[PDB]
Structure 1
Amino acid sequence: MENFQKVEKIGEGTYGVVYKARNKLTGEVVALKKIRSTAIREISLLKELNHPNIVKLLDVIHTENKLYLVFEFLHQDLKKFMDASALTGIPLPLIKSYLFQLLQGLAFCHSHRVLHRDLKPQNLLINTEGAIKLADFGLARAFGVPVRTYTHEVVTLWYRAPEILLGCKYYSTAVDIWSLGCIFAEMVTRRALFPGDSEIDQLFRIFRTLGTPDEVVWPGVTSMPDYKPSFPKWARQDFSKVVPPLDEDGRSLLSQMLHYDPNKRISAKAALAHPFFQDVTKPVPHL
């Protein structure tokens, strides 16, 4: 915080404000997150979790009852890009490139047993080169995911996996695959897949599209903490209706990313080998 000159406020994260700043000694431009022992060790360990598709955590500065996290700076988030592309839509080749890169980032972190747990358009960052990176990876394990952010904003439930909503205490890396699948669908259709406004609304929106889960598709689901036998029983919808005009390879992949059973849900590694990526390229984004 000493060798940092604030340039401007970038926005507000889940835990603290984020500024674009310059290292007063190295001139390095960074994203500085300001948050007002176990958490410190946990976060400090993230400095070694480096990958091209993960926003680099340069440093962790604990001083004066404040925690500063210094990140590599990216010029924009995916949310802004999706909104700017609302009328025309993000070209499929670019959507495929982004999904491909995000899966590489997940595969890396998951190989080290680190999960994100709260993936959303606001923490997926992009540059003018065509790269996309995941930000805030690992912070959920250290701080937890609150109901409201430090500014009292509601933490979105739109990308939350069903096992979390049903009360599972030990989530797995599968929770991130679910979130990414929801984001994938959103990029394709230009509308959130499951825009719930409460935990039950979120759960029922999922149920209405994918069908109410039962022991057939998800062994043990009826014994989960928040599962209720009184849940309405909705029939599953054809994905052809859920994400048109995505082709069959894309629908196949999305379906596997949205499997109810965390055990059946495709892994990031397996997803990277899916036929959908056979013709993947790296386009330069227009905006």
Structure 2
Amino acid sequence: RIIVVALYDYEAIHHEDLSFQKGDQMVVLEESGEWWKARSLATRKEGYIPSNYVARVDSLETEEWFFKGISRKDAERQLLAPGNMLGSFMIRDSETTKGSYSLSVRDYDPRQGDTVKHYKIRTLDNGGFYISPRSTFSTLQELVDHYKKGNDGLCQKLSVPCMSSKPQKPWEKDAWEIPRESLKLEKKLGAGQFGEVWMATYNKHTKVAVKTMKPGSMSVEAFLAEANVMKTLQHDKLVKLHAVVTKEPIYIITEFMAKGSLLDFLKSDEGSKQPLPKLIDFSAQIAEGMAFIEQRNYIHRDLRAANILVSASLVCKIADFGLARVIEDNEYTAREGAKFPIKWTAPEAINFGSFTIKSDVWSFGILLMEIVTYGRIPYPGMSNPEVIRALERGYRMPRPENCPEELYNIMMRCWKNRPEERPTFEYIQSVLDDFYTATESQYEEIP
């Protein structure tokens, strides 16, 4: 026997779904991918429900202030999002002390501006919790209520939990290779060299994006082999692949991203006004996604601002990872022009076709420059031959205006001519994540 409790509002979208509002009764039979075999016994309608819409009985996932599955950096971003107030907070699983917890609180001071402070919540050997030894609690709820009444040493009195939206409903079960008829293409988002992108509706009920590859551009078996790897690369900073139409012309169905590519966004009224620390946060988000790709021994092959997507809430999500590998070179694709852009591509990839995570690192440096210049072409004023010959002689794009020197230093490391001398994405992720909070305490040492 195993019991769970609902969290959000969701009713049937498919056939054998259930209905619940503001948390109802659930009895999970056994698990699956993202859907769980649910037993209601209250509405007595039985079938499947989204596993991320429910919470286990005994645990903290029911609490409005608890955020399971998120990182320290995630916590900082979520709290600093517009809509949160001074003292907004969350409790999360500790990233550096397994089994214990961390409290993250939105702070403000005139010197540093908007910040997030983190506190270690220690667990007592025989039960209960504390941040400061003089103030212990039987439960985390008691801890929260205590610091809601006064700061008692914290940077701020706790106000309200960090804001959050209901999670995206999981993709339809066993709907990986889907019929073309399941898709209504509603709005063309852009033409492209080897395919178009559409906003579309899947089976009348779900908004998606569809990349529609041009005839002749890919074959079914080669694409599917790769797509079956792509779909497993799941990470908050990679765009999610939902489904594919595995008949020519091949369709790739993904989550829809409201603000288009990062290049589009940086060139828009809204995006051109993002301040430098937000640009650096975008850079960090992408580095986090590329560190994941690196950890998974994968290769992007075409990293650039046009292949980063931006969500309605300004989350960056890497797109087109691995796609270049399965675009065919034949008479049909040749008429669409150059396959990869010289100005973004590492010299060893151009010269010897050596595409690796290190050639992605080179490209990431070019992408950093795109970001800090709000989408300017790389190497302005230079032709492609000029770029290649300049690079061979140690020329690199000079530091532009409004670019922190340490960000430029990261670019220069990415652009080492020898791939082995380029940093890892793990390294880049660390430096960008900590860009402004370097030489600071991880946690606040409360009295």
Q: Smaller-chain TM-score range?
A: 0.7 to 0.9
Mind listing any 5+ residue stretches in structure 1 that lack a counterpart? 214-235, 281-287
Show CA shifts across 1:120-175 (max 9, x none): 2221111231211111111122226899968725553221112122x223321011
> Structure 2 matches for 1:46-57, cutoff 5 A?
46-57=230-241
Q: Is the 8 A contact 1:46 1:57 kept in 2?
A: yes
In the other structure, the counterpart of 2:323 is: 139
Paired with 1:183 and 1:159, the residues of 2 have a C-alpha distance of: 8
Query: For structure 1, which segment, 167-176 or 99-108, has the greater mean C-alpha deviation from structure 2 after superposition?
Result: 167-176
In the other structure, the counterpart of 2:206 is: 28
Q: Is the 8 A contact 2:301 2:360 kept in 1?
A: yes
Query: For structure 1, which segment, 51-60 or 186-195, has the greater mean C-alpha deviation from structure 2 after superposition?
Result: 186-195
Paired with 1:87 and 1:6, the residues of 2 have a C-alpha distance of: 27
Show CA shifts across 1:59-92 (max 9, x none): 12212x3211111110211122222269966411
In the other structure, the counterpart of 2:250 is: 67
Q: Is the 8 A contact 1:55 1:134 kept in 2?
A: yes
Mind listing any 5+ residue stretches in structure 2 that lack a counterpart? 1-179, 216-220, 438-447
Question: By how many angstroms is 1:49 displaced?
Answer: 1.0
- Is 1:114–2:298 an aligned residue pair? yes
- Is 1:43–2:231 an aligned residue pair? no
In the other structure, the counterpart of 1:206 is: 391
Paired with 2:319 and 2:269, the residues of 1 have a C-alpha distance of: 22
> Match of 1:15, as an amino acid?
F
> Structure 2 matches for 1:88-107, cutoff 5 A?
90-107=274-291
Structure 2 CA distance for partners of 1:30 and 1:203, relative to 1, 3 Å: same
In the other structure, the counterpart of 1:7 is: 186
In the other structure, the counterpart of 1:219 is: none
> Match of 2:203, as an amino acid?
K
Secondary structure (helix, strand or coil) at the match of 1:273 reads helix
Aligned-pair identity in percent equals: 25
Secondary structure (helix, strand or coil) at the match of 2:190 reads strand
Structure 2 CA distance for partners of 1:148 and 1:115, relative to 1, 3 Å: farther
Q: Is the 8 A contact 2:208 2:254 kept in 1?
A: yes
- Is 1:267–2:446 an aligned residue pair? no
> Structure 2 matches for 1:74-93, cutoff 5 A?
74-75=257-258, 76-84=260-268, 90-93=274-277
Paired with 2:331 and 2:400, the residues of 1 have a C-alpha distance of: 29
Q: Is the 8 A contact 2:187 2:200 kept in 1?
A: yes
Q: Is the 8 A contact 2:265 2:271 kept in 1?
A: no
Paired with 1:183 and 1:147, the residues of 2 have a C-alpha distance of: 31
Show CA shifts across 1:184-225 (max 9, x none): 112223433325876523313534xxxx15xxxxxxxxxxxx
Q: TM-score, normalised by structure 1?
A: 0.76
> Match of 1:17, as an amino acid?
E
Secondary structure (helix, strand or coil) at the match of 1:45 reads helix
In the other structure, the counterpart of 1:229 is: none
Q: Is the 8 A contact 1:194 1:206 kept in 2?
A: no
Question: By how many angstroms is 1:40 displaced?
Answer: 2.0
Structure 2 CA distance for partners of 1:266 and 1:169, relative to 1, 3 Å: same
Paired with 2:236 and 2:277, the residues of 1 have a C-alpha distance of: 20
In the other structure, the counterpart of 2:358 is: 174
Question: By how many angstroms is 1:50 displaced?
Answer: 0.8
> Match of 1:47, as an amino acid?
K
Count of aligned pairs between the two proteins: 249
Q: TM-score, normalised by structure 2?
A: 0.51
Compare CA radii of gyration and give the structure with the larger one. Answer: 2
Paired with 2:405 and 2:330, the residues of 1 have a C-alpha distance of: 37
Structure 2 CA distance for partners of 1:196 and 1:42, relative to 1, 3 Å: farther
> Structure 2 matches for 1:143-222, cutoff 5 A?
143=327, 152=336, 154-155=338-339, 156-165=341-350, 167-190=351-374, 191-195=376-380, 199-207=384-392, 212=393
Structure 2 CA distance for partners of 1:11 and 1:79, relative to 1, 3 Å: same
Higher helix share: 1
